[PDB]
């Protein structure tokens, strides 16, 4: 009844949910660790309070980790296509905005991490755009557990 | 006011009321080139011609009226481009 | 057609395909490849691009 | 168009179409599409069909 | 199902139908259709092309 | 003075733009005793009243071409009367058939006699408007008109030519310049303008299947390699005229 | 390009007339009467910008480009010393 | 009726005005423009409308209308 | 009945409203972070009120999801090719309009947040700026309500 | 009858439409917000006047809505591929046109604006060259308009 | 009757002829523009006179819009292919020549603008360069008309 | 009777020769011009003699359209597939001929130019070179008026 | 027995004789070219020797119209594919030989020439490199003629 | 008997022979010339001991005509595949081994010559170091000779 090749899909969407967050939050944990690492040279009280970037850039791994478990859970041989379409639509969506969130909170980053050591008062700014880049990653994900659960 | 808006109420007064009353004329003869613009439905095809004739009367009024605005808009900016 | 006949796609296909194809994608590369360096080319301003 | 040949055991087995179908003995060309295609008394003997075989027979006798 | 635009033994025609042995016989099937196996109704299945 | 404006109003042929520049440069002529006072600064605006004559000229004549195409945004003028037929002229006994369609689906008008109004006193017919394939027609005409408006004004230049060398005293230009200039250009011109004015003429509706092809025949002509097959001859000895003047 | 030019003024005059001013036509009096007011305005500021400023000054240039070049270089020369008399008129 | 009508009316009017109006200018630094002006008017606007007129002479095919003009036939005129 | 592979498409679409304006919502965010950052240590009070660029790029985000959250609810296994495709084309609309907007805001937010820096009177001109790039989102929301509701 | 893929091309024109149009609109958009934000500095009077190009921009996007709609309103089950490549025609010759006119407003936009604060005499220049720019999507709409409706 | 996948290469025809002249008239207009604006800076009167450049350009998307709209005019459901090649050849060489033309006039415009700012001579050597420039794109007319009527 | 889709090649033979060599002309003249207006500045006499490039480049053009010409004029639906390869090869003949003509006169017209302004004596140096350059274009046309009427 | 479309190989012979040799002889006379007037400025008594270079450029271009016309003559409707792929060889092999000589005459007309305004002894040198430069297009000729005439 | 397209290959293979040789020789020249015309303005005595590398990069094409020579003379429209395909062998085979040889003659030719100008001990070391650049030309040469042969 269902195709021979219909869960090559399925395997496509949890494998990239997986790797296209991964990707996103190593970008995101490269920037914010280049910025961290640099800025910390004048500004030990820093070090701590600036993680904030790579933990954000750590949900962005966890969205992708949270939908490719829900399509791994969720393959079979029976699988109808349909299905597997979905979970690729998944994996794709939570993945690829997994990777424009962990782009997003590199940039934000690195760029807010050597702003709040030039002048202390941008943290609550590099929160705040942060909320703004890591929510792209739960967007990603809110598509991805609709698709994937329709 | 000021004298660049009564200008420009000179010249959309007088464009207003040529193009409008000429529209106005070719309503009223039921001009064949006016038909895209007369606004009737697929039903107003019944019978004959009365619907779209009683359409074309309409927009001669509505082209009519707009002209009356624009008279309005001139005899306002005839005063007030003397008064600026 | 109410027997679902084939679409009587000819022989010669993959020569009309691979003529087409790669005739175009020459063209669009020569075009592409020629604009990119019209577009791209130096204006050679010098006179005024410093005053 | 021409209706196709049908091979037809308990049901439709083989089905058969062209938009010309012709021979020729020592060069000399004929056409057989009207001698074949809508047929209704068309000569289907010696043909045979099997889940894993099949044999289509067209004859032709002048 | 099976589609070719020219299942014949001449050469300006694909020569598809090939002799071993000089013959007296040749043959064209313009637009040869057929299906012989799991065919449903009297309708053609979708047809792979021979081209 | 004349051939600016005129050339201009072909590009720009419109009639309300043609009153609105008219009215524009003559509130600028009739004002002109007060608007010399004003300032300098404004260039737009020095350069436009310094052209006031010249855009009222120019305006006149944008009236008169958007009259001859018969234009004011798409719309028709009240001026001129009409050729084209109403759905009783279509109801002959012939192409009645073509009525019924009509009710059904687009249809082009047959331009039969008896359906047909006749040859038409003006400009563009107001019909052309409305019709769908209006611009077809049109660019057909337009295109041919513009080659003829272009090829008379460069015959024109060449005998400019002409005085401007003779009141230089130049035996030498007027004989090897003009003369074999002005047979190069004619030869060429006038075949190709003859031919425009011969197909408004010689064809019609009953003709128009199989009419052959005015550019085709043009470019055979320069080549001097018509393969005496393909389009139809125009008229009699054409293959002679051909031959000789190019 | 005489007649390039006057397709184009054409077509976006037809444009401009279809997009902007059928939207003002409507079933009764007042409401047709009162919307025609404010999109002939706004038709008529497009006109200006696009069919009489920018097609007008194309036509302009174009017209010129054919006598400068495609008329006027069979017959004249075009090279010589403007005459500029003294006069106090350029004070 | 026929066409030669309207022609040898436009051929009348243009050529009085190039002509006529050209025999009519008085003496004076503006009399070659006047001329001038004359001529090229009447020669442009004579070969103008003359080629427009011409074309409209025994179209090759008519206009084609859009179905709801084609049932306004039937009634406006 | 309808082909099999119909819903991909949909699903397609439905992946590609969420990963091209996560696209663009993130590159609005990391050139307005980028900007607000490097404004903050010669302004440290305006990165309150630079806050808007990102705020606009975060909608981009919301206008990709809306249209992937309705084209995500509007899949069936049979559903038939004309409406999968419509789901494609309302994806790849507000998708690529979403980057689009997304470009407009990044560029836009960066150079406005930096000239405002250095010029108080600008922060009026450039939201007017930010409304003219982000109504290229919702232009592109429009189009795709329009066509996922054929 | 049509073959199923038959609406493909049709949506591909409404979606190209608002797309290619957004992206010039972008472009324009961004270029334009760089110059006027860089220059500012310089001249805060000019701010409110040299919104021009931006929202010229904005036109060449509202082009494409344009025919994106009146493509998508077009749109149907049955609809003839004849019909359905006209659309795509249409959405392509209004979409990339657009991005023509949205390339020219950008780098008149910026160009124009950083002349006028170095001399403001060139701004009815600017608002001039703006046009030609802008036109160009005009034409490509007239273009889509004409192939969109026979 | 006739094939179709016929109607699209004439349609093509008609989208190359529009988009490739709106994308030289762009290149046309964009370098005229930054070199009049980058001009008037040092000679503020020259504006009016070196329009010409962008008007120079301007045509070329008009000789697109001829071609365009007399291929879009000859389209019908069932084009002989015949008939939709030559509309394909016309699209293209009218586009293409006007793309040509395009940057002829922008390389041309931008160079001598500037040149004649220095030098107000240069004026009657730019018009003639522009000559030959824009005969490339009634070149691709020429052509487009032929092939479009053959 | 023999292949449709004949048509196809023959009509790129047309635009082939017409756009490669209106790529050619705009390159020549382009480049050609740049050096004429840059030159200018210094030598406000050599203008009229210094055009000679930019004319050789239409020339270029010229001899592309003349092929284009006889090769649209020698098309029919019925073409044998001899001719309308014949028609290809002359149309890439003349056009990329014209093509490499072109750069060579652009980079020849540029250098020659900037040259003789410095020395007027190159003046004949220039044209001399310069003829090698554009006989290019006329072997390709020869070349391509061989192959389009065998 | 003979197939159709036989001719392309054949035709795309004589077309890369002549193109090719002319993209050789336009890129050897462009170099060249630069560097003659680059060159003459200093030494006007060099312009009428310096132009070798640029004549053996040409010469590389009339082997490709040599060979370009020997296959363009030898075609015929129908022409057997042996004698076709023959015409497409010797079509390369000249066309590319001078592309390759066309380098090198460039580079040795560019360095040979404007060194030899320095250095008046490296004139003969440049002749005999020259040579060397243009036997390859000779080399590419008789591998051409061979070919063409199996 | 053998296949239509059988005789291609070998053609490709004479082509190659030639074409990639002639390129390698080209390089190899033009490099050498660069290296003579700096060398030559010092040391201008020195150009015929410095001509080795040129005349060793004429020997490399030498190798590439004697087998594009020996292939041509071995094609005919009957011949197998087996014969076909090891003579493109010998075409790629000595083609690119004479291009590859061809670039390490002019690199080590232009040091080699720059080199000896400044140090005349290196004029022995140069000529040693391109025969072995000239014996990989042999070695292309040699299994050239063995598969047209074979």
Known sequence: ?150 | ?84 | ?51 | ?62 | ?51 | ?246 | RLWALSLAHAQLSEVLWTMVIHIGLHVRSLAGGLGLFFIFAAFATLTVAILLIMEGLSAFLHALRLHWVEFQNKFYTGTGFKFLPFSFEHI | ?77
């Open chain 2, 1 to 84: 006011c000021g004298p660049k808006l009564a200008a420009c109420g000179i010249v959309l007064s007088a464009w207003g009321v040529i193009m409008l009353i000429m529209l106005g004329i070719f309503f009223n003869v039921h001009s064949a080139v006016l038909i895209e613009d007369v606004p009737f439905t697929e039903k107003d095809f019944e019978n004959g011609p009365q619907n779209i004739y009683n359409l074309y009367e309409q927009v001669s009024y509505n082209c009519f009226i707009a002209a009356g605005l624009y008279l309005l808009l001139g005899g306002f900016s005839f005063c007030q481009v003397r008064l600026n």
């Open chain 5, 1 to 51: 199902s099976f589609h070719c635009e020219y299942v014949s033994s001449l050469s300006k025609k694909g020569s598809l139908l090939v002799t071993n042995v000089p013959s007296l016989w040749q043959m064209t099937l313009h637009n040869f259709q057929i299906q012989a196996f799991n065919v449903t109704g009297e309708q053609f299945s979708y047809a792979s092309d021979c081209a």
């Open chain 4, 1 to 62: 168009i021409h209706p196709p040949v049908s091979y037809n055991d308990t049901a439709p087995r083989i089905l058969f179409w062209a938009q010309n179908f012709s021979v020729a003995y020592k060069d000399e060309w004929k056409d057989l599409t009207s001698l074949t295609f809508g047929v209704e008394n068309l000569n289907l003997t010696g043909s045979f069909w099997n889940d894993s075989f099949a044999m289509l027979s067209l004859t032709y006798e002048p």
């Open chain 1, 1 to 150: 009844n269902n195709p021979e090749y219909s869960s090559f899909f399925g395997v496509m969407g949890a494998s990239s949910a997986m790797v296209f967050s991964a990707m996103g939050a190593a970008y995101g944990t490269a920037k914010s660790g280049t910025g961290i690492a640099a800025m910390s040279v004048m500004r030990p009280e820093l070090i701590m309070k600036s993680i904030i970037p790579v933990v954000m850039a750590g949900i962005i791994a966890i969205y992708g980790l949270v939908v490719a478990v829900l399509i791994a859970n969720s393959l079979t041989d029976g699988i109808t296509l349909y299905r597997s379409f979905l979970q690729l639509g998944a994996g794709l969506s939570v993945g690829l905005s997994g990777l424009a969130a962990g782009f997003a909170i590199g940039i934000v980053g690195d760029a807010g991490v050597r702003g709040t050591a030039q002048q202390p008062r941008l943290f609550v700014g590099m929160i705040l755009i942060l909320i703004f880049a890591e929510v792209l990653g739960l967007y990603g994900l809110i598509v991805a557990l609709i698709l994937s659960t329709k």
């Open chain 8, 1 to 77: 009726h026929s066409f030669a009508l309207p022609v040898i009316i436009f051929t009348t009017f243009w050529g009085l005005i190039g002509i006529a109006g050209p025999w009519f200018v008085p003496k004076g630094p503006n009399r070659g423009v006047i001329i001038t002006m004359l001529v090229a008017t009447a020669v442009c606007c004579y070969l103008f409308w003359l080629i427009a007129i011409l074309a409209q002479l025994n179209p090759l095919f008519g206009p084609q209308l859009k179905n709801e003009t084609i049932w306004y036939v039937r009634f406006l005129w």
């Open chain 3, 1 to 51: 057609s109410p027997y679902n006949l084939a679409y009587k796609y000819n022989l010669e296909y993959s020569v009309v395909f691979n003529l087409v194809l790669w005739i175009m994608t020459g063209l669009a590369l020569a075009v592409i490849i020629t604009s990119y360096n019209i577009w791209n080319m130096d204006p050679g301003y010098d006179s005024i691009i410093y005053r």
């Open chain 6, 1 to 246: 003075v004349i051939t600016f404006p005129f050339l201009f109003a072909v590009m720009f042929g419109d009639f309300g733009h043609g009153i609105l520049m008219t009215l524009f440069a003559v509130w600028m002529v009739l004002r002109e005793s007060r608007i010399l006072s004003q300032k300098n600064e404004n260039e737009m605006f020095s350069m436009v009243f310094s052209g006031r004559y010249i855009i009222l000229l120019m305006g006149l004549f944008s009236i008169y071409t958007g009259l001859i195409y018969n234009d004011c945004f798409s719309k028709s003028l009240n001026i001129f009367g009409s050729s084209w037929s109403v759905r009783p002229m279509f109801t002959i006994g012939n192409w009645t058939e073509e009525t019924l369609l009509g009710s059904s689906v687009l249809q082009l008008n047959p331009a039969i006699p008896g359906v047909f109004g006749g040859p038409y006193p003006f400009g563009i017919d107001p019909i052309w408007n409305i019709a769908t394939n209006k611009l077809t027609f049109l660019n057909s005409f337009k295109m041919k008109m513009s080659v003829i408006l272009g090829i008379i004004h460069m015959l024109f230049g060449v005998s400019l030519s002409l005085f401007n060398h003779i009141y230089f005293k130049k035996p030498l230009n007027i004989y090897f310049g003009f003369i074999p200039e002005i047979i190069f250009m004619s030869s060429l011109f006038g075949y190709l303008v003859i031919l425009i004015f011969y197909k408004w003429t010689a064809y019609d509706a009953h003709s128009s299947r199989n009419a052959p092809s005015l550019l085709i025949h043009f470019i055979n002509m320069f080549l001097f390699s018509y393969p005496e097959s393909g389009n139809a001859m125009l008229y009699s000895g054409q293959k002679g005229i051909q031959c000789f003047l190019i």
